[PDB]
Design an enzyme around this catalytic site. Structure first.
Site, mmCIF file in Angstrom:
data_model
loop_
_atom_site.group_PDB
_atom_site.id
_atom_site.type_symbol
_atom_site.label_atom_id
_atom_site.label_comp_id
_atom_site.label_asym_id
_atom_site.label_seq_id
_atom_site.Cartn_x
_atom_site.Cartn_y
_atom_site.Cartn_z
ATOM 1 N N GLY A 253 0.806 -1.196 -0.016
ATOM 2 C CA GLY A 253 0.098 0.053 -0.053
ATOM 3 C C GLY A 253 0.814 1.210 0.041
ATOM 4 O O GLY A 253 1.505 1.458 1.013
ATOM 5 N N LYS B 98 6.870 -26.566 27.303
ATOM 6 C CA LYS B 98 6.337 -27.769 28.154
ATOM 7 C C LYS B 98 7.303 -28.804 27.816
ATOM 8 O O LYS B 98 7.036 -29.251 26.545
ATOM 9 C CB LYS B 98 5.143 -27.679 28.409
ATOM 10 C CG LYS B 98 4.333 -28.543 29.604
ATOM 11 C CD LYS B 98 3.332 -28.931 29.611
ATOM 12 C CE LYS B 98 2.373 -28.596 30.497
ATOM 13 N NZ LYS B 98 2.659 -29.129 32.010
ATOM 14 N N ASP C 11 -8.183 -29.827 35.210
ATOM 15 C CA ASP C 11 -7.502 -29.062 36.117
ATOM 16 C C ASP C 11 -7.421 -27.527 36.168
ATOM 17 O O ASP C 11 -6.566 -26.637 36.188
ATOM 18 C CB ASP C 11 -6.018 -29.537 36.388
ATOM 19 C CG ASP C 11 -5.258 -29.356 37.571
ATOM 20 O OD1 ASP C 11 -5.771 -29.343 38.547
ATOM 21 O OD2 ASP C 11 -3.894 -29.105 37.200
HETATM 22 C C1 2VW Z 1 6.243 -11.906 37.893
HETATM 23 N N1 2VW Z 1 6.246 -13.282 38.845
HETATM 24 C C2 2VW Z 1 4.949 -13.989 38.605
HETATM 25 C C3 2VW Z 1 7.311 -14.158 38.552
HETATM 26 C C4 2VW Z 1 7.956 -14.320 37.236
HETATM 27 C C5 2VW Z 1 7.788 -15.677 36.413
HETATM 28 C C6 2VW Z 1 9.227 -16.250 36.388
HETATM 29 C C7 2VW Z 1 9.853 -15.550 35.247
HETATM 30 C C8 2VW Z 1 11.463 -15.991 34.992
HETATM 31 C C9 2VW Z 1 11.846 -17.383 35.989
HETATM 32 C C10 2VW Z 1 11.095 -17.636 37.007
HETATM 33 C C11 2VW Z 1 9.696 -17.057 37.187
HETATM 34 N N2 2VW Z 1 7.263 -15.769 35.162
HETATM 35 C C12 2VW Z 1 6.644 -16.668 34.557
HETATM 36 C C13 2VW Z 1 6.053 -16.284 33.571
HETATM 37 N N3 2VW Z 1 5.441 -17.016 32.587
HETATM 38 C C14 2VW Z 1 4.807 -18.177 32.655
HETATM 39 O O1 2VW Z 1 4.872 -18.538 33.582
HETATM 40 C C15 2VW Z 1 4.163 -18.684 31.413
HETATM 41 N N4 2VW Z 1 3.821 -18.190 30.348
HETATM 42 N N5 2VW Z 1 3.100 -18.770 29.536
HETATM 43 C C16 2VW Z 1 3.080 -19.886 29.882
HETATM 44 C C17 2VW Z 1 2.163 -21.289 29.566
HETATM 45 C C18 2VW Z 1 2.357 -22.326 30.404
HETATM 46 C C19 2VW Z 1 1.477 -23.568 29.828
HETATM 47 C C20 2VW Z 1 1.320 -24.801 30.441
HETATM 48 N N6 2VW Z 1 0.734 -25.644 29.812
HETATM 49 N N7 2VW Z 1 0.438 -25.083 28.795
HETATM 50 C C21 2VW Z 1 0.847 -23.923 28.631
HETATM 51 C C22 2VW Z 1 2.562 -22.337 31.731
HETATM 52 C C23 2VW Z 1 3.491 -21.061 32.118
HETATM 53 C C24 2VW Z 1 3.395 -20.099 31.149
HETATM 54 C C25 2VW Z 1 6.301 -14.768 33.436
HETATM 55 N N8 2VW Z 1 7.051 -14.408 34.454
#
Ligand code: 2VW
Length: 233
Positions: free
Chosen positions: A15, A34, A115
């Protein structure tokens, strides 16, 4: 977010006027991986703004892994405990309304979560709540008695999730053993009304907590009902 020019490929002018171009972008994007073919491809077609997106599967080398969407603020359970007292009643209702949108999509596509809890609900940019990963404290009577799963068994878990949200990350049935939970729930005992939850909001939780699964409303009905509470006050 700043993008380095070398990461971009310009292919075609789309565009004119600035100048819009069809291009390709190669980037190291943050993801949640995962770790451990057919059941992994059916999860990919399931796309919704209130569900954690599955981007792909790595199968060439072991351990095999699923590549999910990254949520900036992690799980909701910890998010509510950490930022306790900072949330308004409307913000907490809006959190339940985001989860309900996703669950209404999952029940429509005939997918049981098995869950559903605040620990499996994640917080993203601008406080977006998305459902991921698809425990007698979240289990319905038919699940801890006959192991019968359905969208109605997920509705009971959503009732406990709503409670978890309004209690600002509090642990359900705290200082009560798994056996004590089972016997009391069956008797008719339910989680108390959290201070921030309105009298009507608590009734919806109790409707999610009906002993008869068919007596519990659908996520499609809960979405209408909850959004109505958000419009009135
Ligand atoms: C800000 N606090 C809550 C702590 C930060 C924490 C973290 C970051 C780095 C190291 C340790 C802890 N944190 C975690 C996330 N993200 C996720 O946990 C996350 N982001 N996307 C996800 C998808 C699944 C998942 C499981 N089954 N299918 C999808 C599970 C977990 C996640 C962002 N900040």
């Amino acid at each position: 977010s700043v993008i380095d020019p070398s990461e971009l490929t310009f292919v075609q002018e789309i565009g004119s006027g600035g100048l819009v171009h069809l291009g390709y972008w190669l980037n190291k994007d943050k993801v949640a991986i995962k770790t451990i073919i057919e059941e992994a491809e059916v999860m990919m077609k399931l796309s919704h703004p209130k569900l954690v997106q599955l981007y792909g599967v790595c199968l060439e080398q072991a351990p095999i892994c699923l590549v999910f969407e990254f949520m900036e603020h992690g799980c909701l359970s910890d998010y509510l405990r950490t930022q306790r007292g900072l949330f308004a009643a409307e913000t907490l209702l809006g959190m339940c309304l985001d989860v309900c949108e996703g669950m209404a999509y999952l029940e429509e596509a005939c997918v049981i979560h098995r869950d559903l809890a605040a620990r499996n609900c994640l917080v993203g940019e601008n406080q977006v709540i998305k459902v991921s990963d698809f425990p007698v404290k979240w289990a319905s009577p038919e699940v801890f008695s006959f192991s019968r799963y359905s969208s109605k068994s997920d509705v009971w878990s959503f009732g406990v999730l709503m409670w978890e949200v309004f209690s600002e990350g509090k642990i359900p049935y705290e200082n009560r053993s798994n056996s004590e939970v089972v016997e009391d729930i069956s008797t008719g005992f339910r989680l108390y009304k959290p201070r921030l939850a309105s009298t009507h909001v608590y009734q919806i939780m109790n409707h999610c907590w009906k002993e008869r699964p068919e007596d519990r409303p659908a996520f499609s009905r809960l979405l209408r009902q909850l959004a109505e509470i958000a419009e009135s006050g």
